[PDB]
Symmetry: D6
Subunit: 169 residues, 12 copies
């Protein structure tokens, strides 16, 4: 866990991004633009390579195995808020890397970007993920009703948040 590194996303990592999506079974977006193919993703990456509304980091281990992805989107530098997401490769989901990657993401958000609030969305139907984020310091601030359409159904999601003051202390 202590040997996990965060590295800014490169064009060579887009293949890794693509494979992570085929498992999800939900529409994927790149700077709020939809995509399904690897070629769409690459075109969009070229387009938004300098846009600073979203930042992405590839999580690797010592042996450079691709462990997961840390995502910040909807970054607003006046209100100093950003939406946060984690995606661990299926083969690494049980090993307990999640809490380390969450802390790495919060560290970058609150120590370098100088953000004030980090929030996220967790499906209410996945209560173990909600508990995980609650142990990591997040608190529920909303229960969005039928917010997203996932596998043929409208689903609720917990919107949870953590402030910079609480993480730094």
């Amino acid at each position: 866990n202590s040997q996990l590194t965060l590295r800014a996303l490169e064009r060579g990592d887009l293949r890794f991004i693509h494979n992570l999506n085929n498992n999800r079974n939900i529409m994927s977006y790149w700077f709020e633009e939809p995509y399904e193919s690897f070629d769409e993703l690459e075109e969009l990456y070229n387009k938004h390579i300098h846009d600073n509304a979203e930042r992405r980091f590839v999580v690797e281990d010592a042996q450079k195995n691709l462990i997961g992805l840390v995502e910040l989107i909807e970054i607003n530098y006046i209100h100093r808020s950003a939406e946060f997401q984690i995606i661990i490769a299926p083969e690494h989901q049980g090993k307990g890397f999640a809490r380390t990657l969450i802390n790495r993401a919060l560290d970058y958000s609150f120590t370098i970007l100088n953000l004030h609030k980090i929030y996220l969305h967790v499906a209410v139907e996945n209560p173990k993920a909600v508990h995980l984020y609650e142990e990591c310091g997040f608190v529920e601030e909303g229960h969005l009703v039928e917010e997203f359409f996932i596998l043929g159904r409208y689903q609720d999601v917990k919107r949870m948040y953590i402030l910079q003051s609480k993480y730094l202390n």
Copy 2:
């Protein structure tokens, strides 16, 4: 109030939008792009004239007086949702036009755009607005903590929503 008519926004209405946003005292955005002056607004309008992620409508009375603005942003056509805002000009705020514009907005969103969910954000320190939207069918789904920096401090905002099934089948 039935004299009121909702009309798609034109470039000629941008001055009206600019005068409305000067009194907000919170940073204004046009397709998630900040703007303060009229020239920045007009250029942003020209850039996003065909972008369907946001739709705006100005309401006029029979005499074509500019009453207010109806704003739909973050329009997502996979999840079929959007964020709604209403801005009545100061000189028309106390005339009871609010509930009429809200229902016009919901009717367009749920009948012509065939959207599924309409949500909005209301300052927690504005209880009369929260009650207004509750009277119109909106229900609180979140209490966002220190979401926006307003007048020198981070403030809370209620996120309230209404669904298409409710708006169209509640009286059946």
Copy 3:
């Protein structure tokens, strides 16, 4: 009727088009691109000025009052088919001009463009329009179920057609 003239649409007619589509109850499209405002219509008109997938004509009287619009869309020149739509201004709807405009459209489609088939969609809940088109030479070829979302509910539409051979003989 005999003094109703067909004229290719010009930029100056776009205001007339915008007023006709103001009260329709369904999203208006220009070359399969949606629009609501006059400005959006004008830039779409500039973008598709030379696109021959659709052709539009304003009908005027002898004194050049604008009565309505004839629309040909989805024009395919391999199969020689096109979808037709007529819209008459509210002030001129009851004066009994529809049949003349319909046949003016058919004449242009079958005598100038050399098309083979003209079809149209009419709401099932507008039986008088269905009867009208039947009386002008159209025959039902389909009952599309829940094709369009109109006034808050999905509605059926009749697809009706007429061929070049039948009209020109």
Copy 4:
């Protein structure tokens, strides 16, 4: 069947597409634009990479042999409708994979894209295809007369449809 996988179309698949459309007997189109040569297809693919009016998926087996193509065109997101087409390679046509591909298409349309209605056109002179689509859940809603010019004569086609409610329940 269970090992048949749906994958978003890539540029490398354009050769497979060109071979499928070589023996079809009708002009092939890419986003309503005609084409015959591979080079023309490739530049049309580049031009419409981000156009969401159509979505295409190649179906492969476990060993990644290309079996066929699923096509969604004329996608409207206000009315939530789309036209569907399946094309199986000649070598894999008799192996009885069609039903699996059809339902894979319906699953993506009704569980990810959140569409309401899927319709298709099938030649009247292909009764086995009509029966197949009927057996998979489609119902005839139209008998389009002389819709397409195929093999030197105009031919009728059945328009058949299925709704999201029926498939997901």
Copy 5:
């Protein structure tokens, strides 16, 4: 007749061109591109303003009344040939201006452009026009069968020609 002048076409004359077309009832082209609206024509004129494959001249009288149009198209400067057309305004068609405009057109073709052959197409169903051009020196070289589609029918046309050697002598 001797007071008729030929003047190279200007943008201000496109309105005159447009009105001449509404009487014809046949598809109009501008450098082999179709058009119906005045706005299409103006866009096309701007596009091809320097293309030398076609040349056009407005025929005016002493009082500057717009009498007609002289057209040269498909100009080939290796084989030195060009297709020629005359269009007289309906109000001037009986006064006998035609022969003068034909000679003016041939004069420009054979004395300035140094062309070798000028040909034209006359509907066989208009035998008086065929006789006119025969008196002016043209000879029939072809009877094109069902060449053009005019008012719902395929029509034949006489292709007639005149050489530079014969006109200069």
Copy 6:
């Protein structure tokens, strides 16, 4: 001859077209643009790759040997007509492939493009070609006087045509 297959032209076939046009000894054109060298051809191909006013097809045998070219130009979709040309490579001219390519061209023009009339031009001083096209159904509709300047003198050309109704209903 049934082994022969007609295939849409690709950029890789441009060298074949260039070698075919070197023996013509009459100015070559690509969408009515003159060209002499291969580089000019390749650039013109890139410019008109989507222009539907002309369509070209190369014919190959079972071994993928380049036999000839099928050319349709001046394609008009209002009048539904086009000009047709055939060019067999010198090393395959005497094998009797001509009539097979002509019928393949007519079949594509009249069944998939749904054209109404196909016409062509033949040098009057090439009587065997005129007879060939007559055998395939073409009829003379014009004798164009001094149409083209060829090898130092203006020459006549026969314009010959065939209609869709004939090609598809003659044996019924």
Copy 7:
């Protein structure tokens, strides 16, 4: 003083900006690009109209007389700092508007932009301006030696600052 309003800069105000510069006798910059002419300024304004690294506000009175200019430049939204400048028209420099405009500028900086630090540069040879800014809450943090070249000499400037915490309390 209480009737002074701040208004975001418009293209129509560039003339006012230009006149303010002719009095200064120092090189003027627009988004770190030099300019002397009004035409240079207008071209630069068009170029950087959306750049958010600098913001400008015109100070007007009740009668809409142009009083001065408030300038924020070098805005960094990670470190949340910005350089601040005031320029009062010569005819209004003695009336005591300065302190009001300084507070208006700090108010916008600390209540809307959510900035953390605002600094400025004052010529050491203008000690009365240094005292003014010190009374308004600024403190000296640097004495830059020969930083700028003004009227033939290299001059020192006091760099003074104020934090958001101190202004809000």
Copy 8:
């Protein structure tokens, strides 16, 4: 000599063009634009690859050895005239290829381009070249005085011509 072939110039031949110039010691032009470097030539060739005012042919032998260059410039298709030039590689200048290449150039000019007049410029100080062209059918039509600046001096040149009528007979 009978085994010499003319071939339209290709980009791969520009190197051969370049080497031919280094021997000349006079300023070289490409479509009336000057050049000295091979990179300038290549850029100019890309620019004017479709311009038909100049045509160039590489003369090769049976073994594909580069023998020379045939040049036509200032081609005017109304007056049907063009300037003609020959450049033989130094290693092939004595073998007597010149007369064959001159006839090949005239043949293309008068049998394919259908030109009327071909002229050229020969330095009066090279009387043997003047006699050669006179034997090949050219006649002097001018003695241009100090027309060109060559190796530090203004030099005269004979302008000689030949007409199409004389070459074809």
Copy 9:
């Protein structure tokens, strides 16, 4: 004639050029590009506004009446030569302005442009023009055979020239 002044051509003078070229009855060119109408001319002017291969000047009297045109084309700065043409408006042709404009043209070419040779072409069937240019210092250097096709036949043209050394040192 000393009242006459030579001025660089402006876009406002293009109508004057167009009226001058209508009476030529020989194809007009603008930087070697053919043009017949005013719109083609104006577009060509915009394209070549900075091209220094040609320079043009309009001559005006004290009342600013448009008298004629001075044209220098084919300007080569390595060989330092150019082709010269003069075109006097019909209503001013018999006033003896020709020799004044010619010397103004030569003076600009040889003093400010520092050119070495000025040549021109004159129709052989226009002997009075040939004599005019001879009187001004031009000498015949060529009799071009069937150079231009004019009014239905190929005609001859005299090529005449004058050098800088002569124009500037002849009276010394």
Copy 10:
């Protein structure tokens, strides 16, 4: 003299510039590009609006009559040198304003731009100008032989200079 003001050149001043350069006897240049017509000057002004290699100022009197132009060209900011030129209108040449304009130019060059050396070229055949510049602080540093072709013959020019140290002390 004291009422002579220096103003950065605007587009509206280009007519004044054109009139000054009408009678100069030498080709005029704009950023080393030649020009004669007003239109050519205006487009060159648009092209080099932001090019800082040259800076120009019009001098006006109190009533804003245009007296002349100050020109700085060939400005190098590494070596801090620039070539200077003054042009006074013919109507204002004898009023004795030159010295004031010269020093206004030197003040801007040495007090605002922070240049080190200003040099100029003056014709040897204009001794009064040479004496004038000498009297204002310039010293001859070169006698360029046959530098410029003026009035049909090459002429010498004096290059004269002055340094920042001497002027500011």
Copy 11:
């Protein structure tokens, strides 16, 4: 240390710059544009390849090993000043190369760019760096309060400077 050579930065050196900036733990900028990944850097390099507001040089030993980076930004040619930074690769930090690179940077700034003032910023919590630059001639001119947010808190930075007259005439 005299073996060290200063060389203008090339595109091939961008990987070296990227590896240097990963250890900074403070947001990196390229012509005042933020960047984190190598691809963003390479694109920014292509955009500003000719922008003279910043100049960068990589130092190499005799074996061409990449030692460090010399950075000049905010270059102003009216005031003749610039901000200087030095970044030695971790594996070469303790070899005493710092003072050599600093003097190479000052020599280029004051002899070839003819600048007047060079200033730099040093974290107040890095006293050994402050002493290093003092040893090289830099003098403190400011103590910037809470200038930069570093590792979760606002920190102070010393602004230090040196003038051209001093660097070039101190030993005279």
Copy 12:
């Protein structure tokens, strides 16, 4: 010496140019634009490929070892003047090739380009270079005072010239 050849500069020579300018002690320029890196030089070369204001030639020996560079800049074709500069590689500086390269430059300038005057700048502190250029035909025409900032101090340079008449006779 006789085997030293002049060749127009190519893109492949840009590395040789970069190495020559590495040790010069003065900012290098390409068409008056400064540069330091090879990449900056290469893009400047692409931008000015056709700009004739400057012309450069690499000198090679018989075995094609690169000895130096001849540079012509500030070329004016009205006045027919140009500034000349020679740079010899350090390895070939003492072999006594300078005079040959100088005259090769003069030959091209006076026999091909038809220029009138060639001038150059040489540091006053390089008397051997001054003597060399004097011995090759140059004459001092100026002693520019503090023209360039070299090695931390402003230095004088001699401007020396030679005319076409003197060289060619």
